[PDB]
Amino acid sequence: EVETFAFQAEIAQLMSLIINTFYSNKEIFLRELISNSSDALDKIRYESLTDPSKLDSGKELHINLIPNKQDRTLTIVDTGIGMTKADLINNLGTIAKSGTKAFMEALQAGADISMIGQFGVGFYSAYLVAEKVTVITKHNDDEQYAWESSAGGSFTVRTDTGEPMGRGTKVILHLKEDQTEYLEERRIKEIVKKHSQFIGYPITLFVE
């Protein structure tokens, strides 16, 4: 049972720029996603200090990197705060509007795509390497949802009847045909060591 939504014009614009601009340093997408996971984990930890029951959905706070050549996907999994339906459909977009505006102006002023994180919109860097991104997420007091978008100005959201995750987010990157290097263990290990060696949570890189 799928609902389809239009990205706010600004977000659609950011995505086009990301997909269209010639920029070779694509590997920064992983750092942006791992960072978002780190932030989510930080929040659920902080919240658990005043309400321990919030960890009933899972006490483990970590990150998993799962590559799959068969499906040509790279999934970044975390046990963080998760996102609600309201987050996925309106709230995160509202916030992303200002970040986008600032980021695009900063670019014209000499900045580059690798700085997208300082504007709160790093998630969209996933499109530097993915033709389609599917996001499975579960927040403590909402249901598990599946958000998805191949850009083009729209995204869908549905209640996920798959396999329960308890609490957290899974960013599934359906890679572009010429970006399969991100499925190789050596390459992923290289990027993590280069841009995310100090994340304060365990990061497990699965092998195939």
Ligand SMILES: CC(C)NCCCn1c(Sc2cc3c(cc2I)OCO3)nc2c(N)ncnc21
């Ligand atoms: C609330 C605070 C933690 N900031 C969260 C920003 C949204 N977000 C993001 S960035 C993001 C993710 C999206 C999205 C928009 C953004 I911005 O629509 C598709 O899924 N990653 C998160 C994650 N791994 N866990 C929880 N929240 C995530």
